[PDB]
Amino acid sequence: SVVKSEDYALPSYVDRRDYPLPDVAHVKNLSASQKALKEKEKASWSSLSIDEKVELYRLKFKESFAEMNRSTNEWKTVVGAAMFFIGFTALLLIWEKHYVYGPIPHTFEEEWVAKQTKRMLDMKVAPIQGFSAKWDYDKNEWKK
Amino acid sequence: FENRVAEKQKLFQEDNGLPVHLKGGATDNILYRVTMTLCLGGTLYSLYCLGWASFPHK
Amino acid sequence: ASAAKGDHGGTGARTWRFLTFGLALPSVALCTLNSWLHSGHRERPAFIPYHHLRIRTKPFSWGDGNHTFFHNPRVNPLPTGYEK
Amino acid sequence: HYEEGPGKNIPFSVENKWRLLAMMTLFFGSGFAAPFFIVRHQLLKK
Amino acid sequence: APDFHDKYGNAVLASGATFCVAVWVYMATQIGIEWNPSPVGRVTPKEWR
Amino acid sequence: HETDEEFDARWVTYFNKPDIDAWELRKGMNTLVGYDLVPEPKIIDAALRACRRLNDFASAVRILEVVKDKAGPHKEIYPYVIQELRPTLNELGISTPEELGLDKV
Amino acid sequence: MAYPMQLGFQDATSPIMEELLHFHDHTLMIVFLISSLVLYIISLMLTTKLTHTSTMDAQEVETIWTILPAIILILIALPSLRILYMMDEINNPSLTVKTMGHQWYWSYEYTDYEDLSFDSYMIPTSELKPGELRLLEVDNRVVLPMEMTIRMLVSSEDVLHSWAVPSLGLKTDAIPGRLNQTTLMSSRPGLYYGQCSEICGSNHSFMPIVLELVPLKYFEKWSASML
Amino acid sequence: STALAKPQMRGLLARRLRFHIVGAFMVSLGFATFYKFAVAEKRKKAYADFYRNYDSMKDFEEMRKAGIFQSAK
């Protein structure tokens, strides 16, 4: 029933698939009816009804193996919330770009970059693989 | 000299609840207050000096 | 130094076996690798009949008198130079 | 002797969660803010 | 009995993924960020000398 | 290193001890399920009969549960085990977890 | 120089830089393999309901995971040290050039015959000619003969700097009171760029290196032109 | 139909591990082969091809004509 803080020095109940028979019964204090059932249990189990058998099981254990092993929907909450917060971060980045950053240098302007690109090809920057390798110097175009 | 350790043992085991750094009596409190006042005052002073040194001066 | 290791509590057989297999023999293994890896003959240098080397003031009491005890023909010249 | 148990073994109080939020906000906020204001100080200094 | 994740997990996942993609796409494409992609297959080289 | 046969026999003897107590039943099962095996029917048989001597029906059901659980994805093991145990289940009146509906969330 | 969205090394301009590229490919294969094996094994450990929680004996398996990494390390160290000793080889240069680091620019001295020296400063962004590269150009490039073994001597007249040219595989610290030597051999003409590679104060980011590799006859014309 | 036969009941975890560590080896092998052709040999071929008939004077003259050099107009 009710676990108390002053009880950490005592054996406790656990539902763990690799500790199938815990140190204590799930239900410690039995009612008059429950004690009766435990007396019946000393006779043949064939004389136990299904409902009574389940009640004996639920005296001893909290969750069954199928119950303790159940999957949950938690991953949906975790993945969606994480995406929410990652989305929130982009708001910060938008704010930074709007109020903090000034213009970037003029070397990123389209005409500068076109000229820069030609000069890099003229000096054959990375001509084996990296860059000029990808320019067709005969056809004067990017290698298709 | 004579061995007066037993009398110091009696003094420092007296059940008066005092922590060891004060158990010698009123002299301990004086020395403690001198020490702590110098430490805390000197620390305040060091902070003042930071503030002074943090801006262009002289 | 404290070296960089750590144990004691008790220096005992178990600790010294730990040191033997965990530090001492691995170090021997490493040095064995390093050595048998830098082997491979060096070029023997030009023979020069320096007077402070290949000393003979009395014949050696074995062989022909003129060969050192662990004479290696490949790398130990005689006073007149490398043999054969 | 000292007080023992959850929320008693700490140099700050958790008796009121909103007082606590203020404390924690001052505590972590002041550490996060200090580098921005030092940078401002150095940029303003000269 | 259904927990928070049974009740709301589907909505959290859908709304979170939607917000995230939309705001990042916007940040990436609509506010003047210079990504400086490769000029290969993009830039026409222009005379500089 | 014992043969499987000697391992199994040790565990059958363990659970067959007539005056085995509750602590020993639990110790035995909780130890056994740490190994990389699903216990042989002859072991489970001895364990269920110890449950009988200890007037503990619920642990009998729990033992059937952990046998199924130890098989992991190997779905053929539990029906074979239940097959081999059905004489004992009948003799002792042990309902399976499934019969008790304890296999459903 | 580097180009936008580059993932790997600048194209090799020297034989030693090509050796490093092949050695890096070899080592990165191993890094990717071990990384991916660890990732896979993590997923393998985490994806079964089967259990085994009693004590496991470790001796046999630890032979394998000490001997196999030992062999892999040897397979990295063998080509690694081959290249190390290759870089160190007697190369007999035909030219020596000195460079001196300063806050914040490089000077160069060609004192084999003529006593030539000059300073090399970054071109400010506001003075770049159209199509020139931000933070990388200099006013006076290190003119050098291609396809020739060159001895570069590096030092500093103030704080530490470091003289680097990635596409030649070069990085030599510039330390006052010390004369460090490296060897430079460009397989190709062209312009090769590098940047100061030891923190040196206010303008550490802004003191680049530019080599200008040209045929010997053109190098000689250039030196002759400095009389 | 009749009696179920005894499935393997011992060492299921070890059997799973062995099968997949061997499988991981096979993939590693395979990947080593892919990488040596898609990356390492590709790079070796690219440099060897570039230089096999490379004309460093012709390359220089092209750069010179394009005006890239300070020292050689």
Add this chain to the structure above:
Amino acid sequence: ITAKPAKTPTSPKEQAIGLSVTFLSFLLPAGWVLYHLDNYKKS
């Protein structure tokens, strides 16, 4: 781990408050300094 129910449960509304207050306490001071950077690099 097992635990008693919350002595002073924190509702989703309460969490939204604590979260917002926490995030603001990091963002607003830094924001103020960074917003005013240009205003600093001239004084």
Add this chain to the structure above:
Amino acid sequence: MFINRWLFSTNHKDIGTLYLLFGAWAGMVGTALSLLIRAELGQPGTLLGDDQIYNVVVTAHAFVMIFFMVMPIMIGGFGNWLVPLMIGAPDMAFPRMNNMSFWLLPPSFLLLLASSMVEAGAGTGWTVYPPLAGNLAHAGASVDLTIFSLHLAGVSSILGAINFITTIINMKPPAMSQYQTPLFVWSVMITAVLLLLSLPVLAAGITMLLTDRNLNTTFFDPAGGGDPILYQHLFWFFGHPEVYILILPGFGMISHIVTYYSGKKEPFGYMGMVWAMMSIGFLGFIVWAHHMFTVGMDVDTRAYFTSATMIIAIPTGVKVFSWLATLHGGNIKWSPAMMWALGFIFLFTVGGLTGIVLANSSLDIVLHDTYYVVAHFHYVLSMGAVFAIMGGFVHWFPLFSGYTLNDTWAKIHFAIMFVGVNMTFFPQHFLGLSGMPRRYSDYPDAYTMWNTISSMGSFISLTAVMLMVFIIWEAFASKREVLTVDLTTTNLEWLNGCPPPYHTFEEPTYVNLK
């Protein structure tokens, strides 16, 4: 009573709590500095100023993260809280000296603050190399305050090391040998031996820098016959051990976490784990010059240091495979601490492997002083040391506080942080291979895309840090008091409840010999 308890402490748990508070606050400072770095680099051009203000930020970022966040949290915080409990001891050997190791850190931090406020700050790198750090290129008080900051941090840790070694050798139950103590205890003891031996050398080195700057010595000044490279040897003789100091307590916490959430009573291959930590600690003293492969050393020296550095992969690999073998066969509990530890195993492995790349002196010529190095050490520090810290904090927070966290929130926090650190640092490999130098406030235009992405990653990690503060608040706000935990038979620190009483083990454990 408040002052007696919190300023005059002689209690290992309260002193551990002070260290955790201190290190958390330091972690905010260090995070702010990292965001200033990444704001400067987040687009081309100049945001703040030239390399001076920028590298004052970089320098402070490193000192704060290493000396005021990681070491106080791992060694002062988890070490003080956990080590006496894990050996059943009633406190540390020198409970009063322990309190001085703590109270030296706020003064140390104040000196670091003062260094950045006076003059133009110490824009030297955390390595503080002369002559840049000398009295002509860094005239004025900033570098001297930085040296004094390190002196006080050094004394704090040396005394703490003396305390931990003495406690761990002398205060175990009389039946417990060293080979019956938990791996986290081993990891602290070995870390403490490394601190004891390495910090005095650093102290010697920075004292010589102090006297070069103020008493006209010339240890590092060629004009007097000194040598800047001597400083580098002295610094790195400490600085390589220091990175093993930063990771070893992390290894010890990872061992406990992986064991616990695999449902195991013990880590796989205990004696191999002890061997591996001792081996790493020993090898960590004979490799320092791999920080110096471009300074001009002779080729045989570079070959020795290449080889000796790579062999550390062997014991480290034993630990990685033993963690995997601890997971093997487990009943895995997918707790947030387990997520931190799994992320640790993989990402620490990636960073260790790029360290092995860097160990090759030939390739290090091209990689040295580039962002490849930055990528290497942030995988082992931002995704190794920090993940071990986060895993241990979420695992043991209920022990220290008596309250549970919200596990779903902690899992969200892990997910955000995982994305953020990988987005920040993985592209820095490309920046390094392609030649972007360290300690630059601005970069050639070709480097823009990956710098942009890396700075976006740093903001995601900032969102995680903020969320962590809220999560800790939520736990203290809701007050879910712990009842029981699993596996106390193999996790003694839990067996006095949550939180444990001020005094524990007043009656020591009973352990017999047989």
